[PDB]
Design a protein around this ligand. Structure first.
Ligand SMILES: C=C1[C@H](CCOP(=O)(O)OP(=O)(O)O)SCN1Cc1cnc(C)nc1N
Ligand SMILES: C=C1[C@H](CCOP(=O)(O)OP(=O)(O)O)SCN1Cc1cnc(C)nc1N
Ligand SMILES: [Ca+2]
Ligand SMILES: [Ca+2]
Lengths: 675, 675
């Protein structure tokens, strides 16, 4: 039949792509081609408009199987061709070895690190539910789309998927439909060696619906029926167990050897002949398959055409909501939204930057509907919920509604990070955030790095940033954390010192379209600084205290800026004139012009950095570094700062030693380099 | 009764400790005191010998509840007193706000970051099973101890605990007995807001046995009976559901407010009077409680006395095994074990450092019985299994035996990291390792940081270290990873360049007693270097190519050392004389004498670093840094190196620019500093 021919075409495109690269993963593509065919025939999508907001989304969580995804995208006439498949895994191609949303048309997210994609799918589904609850009206199903996810044994072993699956079951996300490739094979061989749990029983315990397809190597009727069944269960996410043979059809089917290396040439020949293809031909695309797939595309395009008319009618019937929706689909924030940001003066009281963050959120959430967010069981510590908002919960629980704006993630940092990526991936200008203690952002490193690689504007509200948290002690006190994330490409790591800097950090985070943000915030109160403003802090680094005859400049962040200002006064009594630079975000600063940066960190003066965490990175901006390169301590925070000499006198001592060290030397800016 | 009085004493010691600090967590201590009393009465331990190898182990995974643990340790006469409890959460005390194994006698592991302790308990139990299988003989139960773990809702939400619980069920670890504090309260309030899964059904799906105690606020008879029941189930770990009231007895019992802040003074008064204590007194220890607990200690000490005689008889009956066991309990490796390390010459073939690592393991595993390890589903990629070893599996599976030495962790990096910490915590000189790709060590950051803080000599075999892996692309290629771990205190991050350096890295990793190791290893082949040796590489950094008239020194690691040597030859044709330094471990290098370090990185010459990852940290050792501060690419590895100019010519160009940049300048070693 044409469906059989399409499945064979998909299988053989994937195997031929792996063969051409002499690299990659043929096994799962062979096993999942029937399911991919069946799912894409149920999905609504436009290959010519990858951003249609009411499309169904597909996520390949087992991202090593991407030759399968690329084959589907090529067959459906996305902006990806057979010529691109021939360049699978080749430098610069549109067909990288794991799918990247920035590079691959029709890749919703970046997968490959196992477990991430299913969590991203939870976030896409969460966003769809929130979006539909916000905009749908009687006779106006603006949003009614599904989220389809493929995942394998590896994703099911990774703890992040357990976190997200527990939460998705709690949230009753009935438009999520996941498919487990139950092939009993991983890299180390049989799943009997390490993965003998009853997966289905576990998913029932989370509140998921289950459909089992015992013959998923051939039974596309049953796979389609499983989707129909899942769509009837509106209050539970569904897991479809696809019992498959890894590498189906290969001489090596059902073995670990077919997982992750190219097939032998003779094996590819026998595949082709068994399925009616020419063993001498590669990258065959039968025109009847193209015709069949084109029919589905044309039908989907008529569905989108009708949706566009529905949207026009919605704008007439609901003028305010319609204009809001249009603005969001255009990628634009509300005009002058930033006038809601709080502004402070040096006469205002000292405030912890976690509390300043609460105040910002309180002002901007009512002004910017596309802001949603939550905390990983730290709501009263991170201060992430605006008073008078409702939680995102299924109404059946009585605990919230899908129109709610605040997510109770539970103690699930890693899944929170990957769910945030899915919310961002949904689109519609969502600007979403997640709170935890800074030290436990590290639990989510797998997802955070993907936020950076995927260019998603997510925000971590990362409180309790240092030894300033005090008594909880060294298991809770960051040392390496900012260095880790600053060393990752494309992460904006804001460590605001005061109220105006906190507002600048949020301005950056909310305006972002391609860069994730981490906001490192204090437990403890900090003074409002003389010289700070949103305008200057928005440059990432700025001169707080200008001293035209400086003997030294002190560059600092966060809680250490006030310390530097106090040290300046001690130094004046020692006959040393200092300037102060505040560097709330190194990435934003780095992106400023060379001339601006040199105005902040000039030639001809020693520069000392002060930040109560690792000194890594700081030589970009300073000649000498005063930091904390050992673990912390459990005690009252002021006593810990005194122990480690992060005091005005301790900073002054090191500044005076820095001045003396450079006596008789020629000093150029740390910004200079040889190449 | 005296048992009732003991429970009240525990409760009130914990509340009084929190009160004195005006900081900490009274709720879970109040709720878990009956269970703590019951469990410690079943446990075999010696407060005067915390390292008795056949002790039962206790782990408080919900480490914020540590006022409970400290109270137990004080009451049982560990090296911790009421005076230490009065200093709870105070700078420098033996009673920090979360338990630290380095600081607290009777704390087996460092907990507080949720989810870790239960995984550590899995590792303690894994080690006990392996140890017993290795040494026990008929009439000689050298090892027969249990592992008891307390954990809360937060630990059950963290994905790492799901990973470890799936694996522990697979491994049939019947001497593991965990207790869930089922109090339905977390920081954000009721567990109904975020944690509605059927936990018991999930644990059954992993293959655990369940006992439920519905009245754990009072029913110590049932808690003791649950332990007895668990001990009869020898082929399944057991989860005991303790239904408790958080803060039991407080006016605020059953509320989130009792989780994490001191009780009100009037609340403490009513607790004391309801339980027969003097509301005017704090830190009361009734002498009848001390007497009861002392009876149990005395009985346990007689058990250890008899074990010591059993061990003496074992040494007579099994002379070789007995001497091996004695050596391990003394903390000593086999005499001259390091003579098994492979040694190479520059005439030997190029080899990838992952394969060199395989070869080392092949030679040292037969020589050092306390080495065990595994991989997170990457055995044929990381090359972590020695041919001719058996896997650690329950014999009932037919897939291995508990005497086996190789662990199939599955796709569970984070739990692998925390399980390794538990294996190390067991003691008996275990030197254990875990393989994954370097980029996915980041999934386990929570546990890795605890390896460093806990001072455990665990080893990550972290292969596929860079863009040198090629086609899998940027989702797999480390950039920030070494900077992250190098910035963490107390992590030895070895990036060996060749065969001799790989042997030095293992010598360090296996000899370690207080420092975790990460070995960053290549996919791709590297040449054997002229000038390398185990002796020189053991210094962490060394002069590979000495040039007395150097115009520049190039410092490099790993795959970039050979690149630097090739660049030296290009530079010679440009009239520039270079030296080369190899820096296989920055931490080991930093620990050498100042004079040794200056012999490697002298004054008076520009120094350029070369490493194909982040430049963070490298200014410790160099004036200019050539690194990779952007994400990678999917293609054949040599083409990626060419794209980014990590070629002999690209390095030479940057070296020549470095020489020119310092013309006319006075250059001092990067090792110099102002303070
Ligand atoms: C361990 C593996 C994989 C085996 C996956 O087994 P599956 O059953 O999911 O796949 P199948 O055999 O059915 O094709 S693929 C690559 N990989 C390394 C890897 C490790 N850790 C993380 C976090 N991300 C990764 N990609
Ligand atoms: C979110 C929390 C905790 C609430 C724990 O709730 P439980 O039910 O376990 O405790 P109970 O209320 O019953 O006392 S305690 C502190 N903490 C922050 C925290 C976050 N992330 C990680 C990884 N480690 C942490 N310690
Ligand atoms: Ca599989
Ligand atoms: Ca709880």
């Amino acid at each position: 039949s044409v469906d059989q021919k399409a499945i064979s075409t998909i299988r053989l495109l994937a195997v031929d792509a792996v063969a051409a690269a002499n690299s990659g993963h043929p096994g799962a593509p062979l096993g999942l081609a029937p399911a991919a065919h069946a799912v894409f025939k149920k999905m609504r999508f436009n290959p010519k408009d990858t951003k249609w907001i009411n499309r169904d989304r597909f996520v390949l969580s087992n991202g090593h199987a991407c030759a399968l995804l690329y084959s589907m995208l090529v067959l459906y006439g996305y902006d990806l061709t057979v010529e691109d498949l021939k360049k699978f895994r080749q430098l610069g191609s549109k067909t990288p070895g794991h799918p990247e949303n920035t590079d691959v048309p029709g890749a919703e997210v970046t997968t490959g690190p196992l477990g991430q994609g299913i969590c991203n799918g939870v976030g896409i589904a969460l966003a769809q539910a929130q979006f539909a609850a916000t905009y749908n009206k009687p006779d106006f199903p603006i949003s009614d789309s599904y989220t389809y996810v493929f995942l394998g044994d590896g994703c099911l072993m990774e703890g992040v998927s357990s976190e997200a699956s527990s939460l998705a079951g709690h949230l009753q996300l009935g438009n999520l439909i996941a498919f487990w490739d139950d092939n009993k094979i991983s890299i180390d061989g049989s799943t009997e060696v390490a993965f003998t749990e009853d997966v289905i029983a576990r998913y029932k315990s989370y509140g998921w619906h289950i459909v089992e397809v015992s013959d998923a190597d051939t039974d596309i009727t049953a796979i389609a029926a499983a989707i129909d069944e899942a769509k009837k269960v509106t209050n539970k996410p569904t897991l479809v167990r696809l019992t498959t043979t890894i590498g189906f059809g290969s001489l090596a089917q059902g073995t670990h050897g077919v997982h992750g290396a190219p097939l032998k040439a003779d094996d590819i020949k026998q595949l082709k002949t068994k399925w009616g293809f020419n063993p001498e031909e590669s990258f065959a695309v039968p025109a009847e398959v193209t015709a069949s797939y084109n029919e589905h595309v044309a039908e989907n395009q008529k569905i989108q055409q009708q949706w566009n008319e529905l949207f026009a009618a919605y704008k007439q019937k609901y003028p305010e909501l319609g204009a809001e929706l249009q603005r969001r689909l255009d990628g634009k924030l509300p005009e002058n939204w930033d006038k809601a940001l709080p502004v402070y003066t040096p006469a205002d009281a000292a405030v912890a930057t976690r509390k300043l963050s609460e105040i910002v959120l309180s002002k901007i959430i009512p002004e910017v509907p596309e802001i949603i967010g939550g905390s990983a069981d730290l709501t009263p510590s991170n201060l992430t919920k605006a008073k008078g908002t409702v939680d995102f919960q299924p109404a059946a629980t009585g605990l919230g509604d899908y129109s709610g704006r605040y997510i109770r993630y539970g103690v699930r940092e890693h899944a929170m990070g990957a769910i945030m990526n899915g919310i961002a991936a949904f689109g519609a200008n969502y600007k979403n955030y997640g709170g935890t203690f800074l030290n436990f952002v590290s639990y989510a490193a797998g997802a955070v790095r993907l936020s950076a690689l995927s260019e998603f504007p997510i925000t971590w509200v990362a409180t309790h940033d240092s030894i300033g948290l005090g008594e909880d002690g060294p298991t809770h006190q960051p040392i390496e954390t900012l260095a880790h994330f600053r060393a990752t490409p494309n992460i904006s790591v804001w460590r605001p010192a005061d109220g105006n800097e906190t507002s600048a950090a949020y301005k950056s985070a909310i305006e972002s379209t391609h860069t994730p943000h981490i906001l490192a915030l204090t437990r403890q109160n900090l003074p409002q600084l003389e010289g700070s403003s949103i305008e200057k802090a928005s440059k990432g680094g700025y001169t707080l205290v200008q001293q035209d005859k400086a003997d030294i400049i002190i560059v600092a962040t966060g809680s250490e800026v006030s310390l530097a200002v106090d040290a300046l006064k001690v130094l004046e009594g020692q006959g040393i004139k200092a300037g102060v630079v505040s560097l709330p975000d190194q990435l934003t600063f780095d992106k400023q012009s060379e001339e601006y940066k040199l105005s902040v960190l000039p030639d001809g003066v020693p520069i000392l950095s002060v930040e109560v965490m690792s000194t890594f990175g700081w030589s970009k901006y300073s000649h000498q570094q005063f930091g904390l390169n050992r673990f912390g301590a459990s005690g009252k925070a002021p006593e810990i700062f005194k122990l480690f000499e992060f005091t005005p006198e301790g900073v002054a001592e090191r500044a005076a030693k820095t001045v003396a060290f450079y006596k008789g030397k020629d000093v150029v800016s740390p910004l200079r380099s040889a190449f």
